[PDB]
Design a protein around this nucleic acid. Structure first.
Ligand SMILES: [Zn+2]
Lengths: 174, 511, 417
RNA sequence: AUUUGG
RNA sequence: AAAUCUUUC
């Protein structure tokens, strides 16, 4: 019962505290990777099992003429995943930590000295070349049928029910 | 070679200095300088400016972020064996957990509320009291700080008690909020380049610029100044307790405790120290000990010096200079108009730290350089090819790879040298996606993380959690076991091993 | 059961239904909806799950049975609950932010505030201090840099040979001869031999710094990359000769000679002595079976060796060359010489910057960058920014500083700015 | 930390 | 012995 020794005197701790416990070496990174052929084994595993499952994504094709200009701060607003998507990704077996990290809206300020006629937003590194980036609050609780819950009617007043059309638990507010 | 650059170059192409020297000498020198400033013979530590134009956020709810209360960085934990104080170095996570165990509290918020709610300093909050917490929080340990370019003599940082860390984190969060309210330059998400552009806009109306730095910054920001700023922004008893602990601080050097009543110890209240000068006057753009201001006549320069002296921001005569054609702040140099000064500037080299990590970091560095006008794209292409060749020379032995198929980097037994443009525009074999700066973590990074996490009797893992569960949720041993069992059962139901990695870029691209 | 949560719990469950129309959550603060004849165990009762829900502020637990479900309202407009459904319900319903009494404000004043304030008052306070007098003058001229270089040169002098800096050039011996020379040099110094590896044993240390002098520059450094790779390999493979394409070194652990029960295996913090071969013709010459070579040593820390081993010489040279001016030829002592000087010596300087773990050249470069952008500087103080001899100690860092200053002087002489 | 980098 | 309170299993 390490929980009784790590957090002696407390029967409950926050998830942040618990993870901090779960989650420096003078050896260089090269020697660490060489040790026990850990990097070689990881490369073999990646090439044999992990690599074939990687989804091939399309390449960038959009381009516009650009000219050197005064330094400016390009703002890229990368939106965060919505509840429906986050839940679908976690239920599909994706790493929950990565999904939670991506759940938050992100804003990136990058210095670029390059402008287009239409003032477009450029991809990372590809600014010189000109590769452009271009009621009831029905809530999806989960993608499963929780046991002993009401079936979704035609007019769900304010409760939480289960939808057959979409295999999920839907919460209707006001 | 840095001396013969046509443009501006700071010589950052090599890594920072390293040293195994003990921090005792540096800590002793810092304490001696603090004492000398305290006796008021070398520099000024008495704040005289008026901090009236600072909003009083006394009614703001007390906000605590738990992310910074736990970390692998060192910290000082104090024990009282038989009436004597023993200071031990331990990870900040372990120190905070021990603090919470000593005063039974579910989370730091409960500890803060209990500390602020007692009606006496001697009342018990578990196996301790507010008086004991204050007594223990004034003990610091000395550690060395190296790998800082331009600092051949490594500096001394100081590790504090978890209670001091908690109060400091609260006060610093609030001070940063006030700073952001003051001016738009202190927005949390602001790059050094954005700050430099803002400064160039601000100081465009005058002739001369005063690129300046403050000397003995930590040793000159007294506890009185911190308390004055905190009272100005309405910190209540938290600020008083923090100032009391700072005034009575002791540092354990070797095996002796040395009193350091003068000045703060290391950069901890950077927001408060900045806010001192910022609320004194709206004439500087300062980030701790780095400020920029402009003047038109010698009288304005004398007024600027008077303001700096009154704000306890002693000017550094060694590295403060006046310029008319250039501006510099946060190590970023611009022209008066706002353009980035031609030259390498702050570009830093990528040391060899893995067959694929090196390529990814080099790609990120070259992308940053090319997005600005640091170098043209063809130069970046040539540099990337050269780096790939060097990585091939360094990492192409059987101890790293046993493959010979194509589509692999030449450093992993393959015979392909991906062009920088092809890599950047996702025009490569999927194996190269990791090498992209925005791509998934490389194999080497995962291997290093696993090695660190596998180096005992540990608790059950609590990774791969549902995105909807907050990290502030209280969980017991049974709760953790149930969560792990449910997640493993669901993953098995999918006929799946450890969960598949998720990458935002790939997911958005294929959506 | 606190009255401050009556409004909070009232809005928590507006019209939620559980069976067909009946309210799912019954408020414990309302007589009409409260269940009569049963004890109250929470702010609300959930009929669907047959549970009790209680609301508590951040870090302010309430006196309720453990079975009661607690929903924590954090101070940053976020809510936490073990039951995901209740958390979602509170998040959706509490969109209208209504402040609840008892929230701990940052300005909260404790009962001991006055006592701590008096204690702070009784404690020592600082004195005013003197107001500095600042005179702004022009930046240092070529004469000042020349004066600094001459002062360094006359204070420390020069070595007869380049020592380990000469290891960047071929020693003129094949692999077998190099290995033989290294092994026989190790044997001649009475190094301990154990498990086929060499160890240097020490008993007493004269606690004073070693002799410091400026190393003259070899002609070139063709094997800089090879030398750095060898040093990187030696961080762990110590005690046996390590071979490269055109050079070899021997990193022997330096271990205390406690006695019969002495350290046998190197630990994390054990230092290394790196021995390298160069062309003969200096004091450190060694001969064996007709093979002659200059054997030069370097005592390196673990962190020093690690830092030196990770540097990328070729990429750094190319990046510097991207936007560089015409480098002039220089002599053995870093002096402008267009008659017999060599431009390859600059490469050597770069190698020195890689071998110096204190990276004093970085500080010199930062100060020179300040110098080139400066219209006026503080009198008699900015000039005292190139005087870094006190901040470093050793032959390698001293030579690095001296040649950084020489490079600054050469830039001022050849390409005035 | 040598097992295992030309 | 050396980049010397470091080379401290
Ligand atoms: Zn010699």
């Amino acid at each position: 019962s390490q929980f009784g020794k790590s957090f002696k005197g407390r029967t409950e701790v926050t998830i942040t505290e618990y993870r901090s416990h779960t989650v420096r070496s003078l050896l260089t990174a090269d020697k660490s990777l060489r040790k026990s052929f850990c990097f070689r084994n990881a490369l073999n595993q990646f090439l044999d099992k992990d690599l074939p499952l990687l989804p091939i994504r399309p390449k960038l094709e959009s381009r516009v003429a650009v000219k050197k200009s005064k330094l400016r701060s390009q703002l890229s607003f990368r939106p965060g995943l919505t509840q429906e998507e986050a839940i679908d990704l976690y239920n599909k077996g994706y790493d929950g930590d990565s999904v939670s990290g991506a759940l938050q809206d992100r804003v990136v300020n990058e210095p670029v000295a390059y402008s287009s006629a239409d003032n477009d937003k450029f991809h990372r590194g590809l600014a010189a070349l000109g590769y452009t980036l271009a009621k009831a609050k029905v809530t999806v609780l989960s993608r499963s049928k929780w046991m002993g819950y009401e079936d979704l009617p035609q007019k769900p007043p304010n409760g939480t029910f289960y939808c057959r059309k979409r295999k999920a638990m839907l919460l209707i507010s006001c | 070679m840095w001396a013969f650059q046509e443009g501006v170059c700071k010589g950052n192409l090599l890594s920072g200095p390293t040293s195994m020297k003990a921090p005792d000498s540096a800590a002793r020198e810092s304490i001696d300088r603090a004492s000398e400033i305290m006796t008021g013979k070398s520099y000024n530590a008495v704040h005289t400016g008026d901090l009236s134009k600072l909003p009083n956020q006394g009614e703001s709810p007390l906000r605590i972020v738990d992310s910074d209360l736990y970390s692998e960085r060192s910290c000082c934990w104090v024990i009282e064996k038989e009436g004597r104080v023993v200071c031990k170095s331990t990870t900040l996570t372990r120190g905070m957990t021990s603090l919470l165990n000593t005063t039974k509290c579910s989370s730091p918020s409960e500890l803060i509320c209990k500390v602020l709610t007692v009606e006496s300093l001697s009342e018990k909050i578990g196996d301790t009291s507010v008086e004991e917490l204050l007594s223990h929080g004034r003990y610091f340990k000395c550690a060395l700080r190296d790998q800082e370019r331009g600092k051949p003599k490594s500096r001394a940082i100081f590790l504090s008690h978890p209670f001091f860390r908690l109060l400091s984190s609260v006060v610093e969060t609030h001070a940063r909020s006030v700073l952001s309210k003051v001016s738009a330059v202190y927005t949390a998400t602001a790059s050094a380049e954005q700050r430099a552009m803002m400064a160039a806009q601000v100081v465009e109306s005058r002739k001369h610029v005063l690129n300046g730095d403050c000397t003995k910054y930590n040793e000159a920001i007294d506890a009185d100044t911190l308390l004055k700023v905190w009272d100005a922004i309405g910190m209540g008893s938290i600020g008083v307790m923090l100032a009391y602990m700072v005034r009575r601080k002791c540092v354990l050097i070797k095996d002796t405790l040395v009193e350091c009543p003068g000045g703060m110890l290391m950069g901890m209240f950077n927001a408060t120290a900045t806010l001192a000068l910022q609320g004194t006057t709206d004439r500087f753009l300062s980030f701790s000990d780095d400020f920029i201001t402009s003047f038109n006549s010698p009288a304005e320069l004398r007024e600027i010096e008077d303001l700096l002296f009154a704000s306890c921001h002693n000017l550094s005569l060694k590295k403060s200079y006046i310029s008319v054609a250039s501006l510099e702040i946060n190590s970023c140099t611009l022209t008066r108009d706002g353009d980035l000064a031609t030259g390498l500037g702050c570009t830093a080299g990528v040391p060899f730290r893995g067959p694929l990590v090196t390529l990814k970091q080099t790609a990120a560095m070259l992308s940053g350089a090319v997005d600005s006008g640091v170098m043209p794209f063809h130069s970046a292409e040539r540099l990337f090819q050269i780096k790939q060749q060097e990585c091939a020379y360094r990492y192409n032995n059987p101890t790293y790879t046993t493959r010979n198929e194509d589509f692999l980097p030449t450093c992993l037994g393959g015979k392909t040298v991906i062009s920088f443009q092809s890599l950047l525009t996702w025009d490569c074999h999927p194996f190269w996606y990791q090498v992209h700066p925005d791509g998934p973590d490389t194999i080497d990074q995962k291997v290093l993380s696993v090695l660190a996490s596998k180096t005992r009797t540990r608790l059950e893992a609590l990774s791969d959690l549902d995105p909807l569960v907050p990290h502030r949720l209280l969980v017991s041993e049974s709760d953790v076991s149930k969560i792990r069992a449910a997640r493993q059962a669901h993953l098995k139901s999918l006929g799946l091993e450890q969960p598949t990695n998720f990458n935002y870029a790939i997911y958005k691209a294929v959506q | 059961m606190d009255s401050r949560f009556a409004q909070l719990t009232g809005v928590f469950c507006d019209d939620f239904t559980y069976s067909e129309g009946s309210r799912r959550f019954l408020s414990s603060y309302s007589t009409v909806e409260r269940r009569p004849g049963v004890p109250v165990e929470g702010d609300c009762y959930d009929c669907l799950k047959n549970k009790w829900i209680a609301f508590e502020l951040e870090g302010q637990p309430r006196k309720f049975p453990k079975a009661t479900v607690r929903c924590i309202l954090n101070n940053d407009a976020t809510y936490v609950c073990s039951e995901q459904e209740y958390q979602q319900i509170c998040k959706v319903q509490f969109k209208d932010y209504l402040e609840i009494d008892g929230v701990v404000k940052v300005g909260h004043k404790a009962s001991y505030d006055a006592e701590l304030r008096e204690r702070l008052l009784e404690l020592p306070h600082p004195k005013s201090g003197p107001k500095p007098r600042i005179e702004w003058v022009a930046p240092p001229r070529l004469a000042d840099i020349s004066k600094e270089t001459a002062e360094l040169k006359r204070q420390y002098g020069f070595f007869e040979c380049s020592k380990f800096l000469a290891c960047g050039e071929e020693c003129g011996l094949d692999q077998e001869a190099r290995e033989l020379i290294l092994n026989e040099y190790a044997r001649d110094r009475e190094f301990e031999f154990r498990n086929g590896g060499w160890i240097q044993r020490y008993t007493v240390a004269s606690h004073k710094p070693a002799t410091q002098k400026i190393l003259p520059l070899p002609a070139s450094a063709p094997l800089a990359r090879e030398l750095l790779m060898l040093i990187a390999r030696s961080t762990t493979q110590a005690g046996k000769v390590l071979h490269s394409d055109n050079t070899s070194i021997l990193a022997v652990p330096v271990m205390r000679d406690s006695g019969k029960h002495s350290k046998r295996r190197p630990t994390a913090s054990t230092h290394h002595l790196v021995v390298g071969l160069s062309k003969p013709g200096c004091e450190h010459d060694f001969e064996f079976d007709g093979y002659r070579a200059a054997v030069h040593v370097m005592h390196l820390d673990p962190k020093q060796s690690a830092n030196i081993g990770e540097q990328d010489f070729v990429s750094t040279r190319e990046i510097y060359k991207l936007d560089m001016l015409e480098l002039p030829p220089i002599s053995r002592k870093g002096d402008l010489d267009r008659a017999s000087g060599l431009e390859t010596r600059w490469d050597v300087i770069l190698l020195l910057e890689c071998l110096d773990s204190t990276r004093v050249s970085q500080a010199v470069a930062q100060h020179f960058n300040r110098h080139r952008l400066a219209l006026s500087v503080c009198k008699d103080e900015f000039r005292k920014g190139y005087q870094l001899a006190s901040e470093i100690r050793g032959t390698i860092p001293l030579s690095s500083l001296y040649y950084s200053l020489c490079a600054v002087r050469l830039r001022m002489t050849v390409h005035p700015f």
